[PDB]
Amino acid sequence: MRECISIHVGQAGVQIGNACWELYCLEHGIQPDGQMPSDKTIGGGDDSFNTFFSETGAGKHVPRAVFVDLEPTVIDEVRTGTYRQLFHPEQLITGKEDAANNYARGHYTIGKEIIDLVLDRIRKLADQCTGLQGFLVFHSFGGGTGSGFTSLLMERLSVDYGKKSKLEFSIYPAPQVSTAVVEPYNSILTTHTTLEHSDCAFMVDNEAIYDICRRNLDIERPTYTNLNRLISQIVSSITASLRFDGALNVDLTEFQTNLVPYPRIHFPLATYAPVISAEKAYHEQLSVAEITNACFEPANQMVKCDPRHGKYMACCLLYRGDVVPKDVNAAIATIKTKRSIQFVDWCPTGFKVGINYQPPTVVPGGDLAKVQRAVCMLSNTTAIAEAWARLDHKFDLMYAKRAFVHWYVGEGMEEGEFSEAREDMAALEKDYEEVGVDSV
């Protein structure tokens, strides 16, 4: 049996989880109260697929999720909203104040006394699961909880389970716009967690998705709901292979194999090609070649980093809908023909291809148009280091004068740890070049 456990930490994680579970319930025909009319309507088949939902005796389907947050507000919204009857009552709120944009509060003092309960619930879910494949962890750098509690949870999960895959979907700080003054400290202090314990971490940027919404979907004033829906589409495209039939299916292990050249390099970028409005859905073929080319455009990247400044090291394409191998082979050949897209010398293979028959759905009240075909491209490239470098500069600008340090030091953290994280990050920045150099 194929199944993976979703964990959501912090406000960003919880809201992305709301969008994700809306999409999953719409995809599998599950009502908000957990019932499935399709079971009685058809009398056969398998619609409440076990990759995300567990079926009880009475026909109700409960999701395999663990929501965590130190604020009671964000999850109390869920507990009294449209989907209050869907989730299990165990929602794991800490009845106290929040991490307050502090790594120390979410990792040392207040992050504890809730970690044990979270691991107990995860243990129960794993015991229910048969042939568990991995964990999908949703969090956000910059926030105190999403950083510190994520570090605690990943450490304990690596100690306990070890061999199971662990994928992150995180919101990296943007180069220009941000919502806090102490973002660089929190983001830098997560390097150890995101490097040693995570097996493959996907990073997204708010500025990039704002630009995508403004240019493609013609939305002048997007809010976080659109961002969450796009990220949910990404995650659904990633995990579709475990649920529906396809000409070429790619599970999480074979997915990881063809994307991590080395252990310390598992930081790919993600892109969704046919992001297009309803009115612009007409006038365009939206063939395989068009979406494949649009996946490689610098303007459509989900993180503010230019692939033209680096070399592509691996690429994995995941197609949905009316797609046939002839067209994807032609598109791959055309992409290889172009000279702007530079591949490293030591990876002649280049591309991994997976195809799925189930086309992407459309959420009611959404913005993405209904399409016959879609593709999600995940690319391990060297350009991402540039983004890291920018953030590092900001950290230095705040550490030369020890601004805001006393807040971290007063909650158990030692000063030198700050310095330590920086060299660790520097080491990472030296490995994501020493690999891009042409061989001799």
């Binding site: 003092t109 020890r402 006393h406 030091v409 909650e411 158990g412 953290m413 000063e415 740890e417």
Partner: protein, 175 residues
């Protein structure tokens, strides 16, 4: 200064030794993984010495007055290796705060007494954050100004301690 501080008069080595023993007994000490007798509080030992020359014609009595200040600071801790929890953690946090500010002061002081001395002689304005902690406040005249000061750094030969040990040397290199 510290108001209502019991300044005891002493006359012989045995009496001050007894005072020392009582003071060391009275300190706050707790056990941690790093050390069985980890100190929990900074300590300052002050000796006020008066030197008098008596003459009925010309000389001046109370010729010299000096203050001898021996300071034992609780060291920085890391929660992972220390294994602290609850009160032992909170105490440590305060200790780290009282050290971090101190480091800044040392660094700040150094640059100023390096700058005006070497740069030109401008002496325009330089702020030293003495008031951010009571330790730095009480030792305002000791770290700089009207005293002669010595700094004794303690090192750990353990390889595992390297990333911490070097830090001490750096501040010592500035001291």
């Amino acid at each position: 200064y510290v108001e209502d501080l019991s300044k005891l008069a002493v006359t012989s080595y045995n009496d001050i030794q007894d005072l020392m023993d009582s003071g060391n007994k009275a300190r706050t000490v707790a056990a941690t993984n790093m050390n069985e007798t980890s100190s929990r509080s900074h300590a300052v030992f002050n000796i006020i010495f008066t030197q008098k020359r008596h003459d009925a014609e010309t000389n001046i009595t109370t010729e010299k007055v000096s203050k001898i200040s021996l300071v034992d600071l609780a060291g920085s801790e890391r929660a992972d290796s220390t294994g602290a929890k609850g009160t032992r953690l909170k105490e440590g946090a305060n200790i780290n705060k009282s050290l971090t500010t101190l480091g800044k002061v040392i660094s700040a002081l150094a640059e100023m007494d390096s700058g005006p001395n070497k740069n030109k002689k401008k002496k325009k304005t330089d702020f030293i954050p003495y008031r951010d902690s009571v330790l730095t406040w009480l030792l305002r005249e000791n770290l700089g100004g009207n005293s002669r000061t010595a700094m004794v750094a303690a090192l750990s030969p353990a390889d595992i301690n390297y990333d911490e040990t070097l830090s001490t040397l750096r501040y010592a290199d500035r001291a």
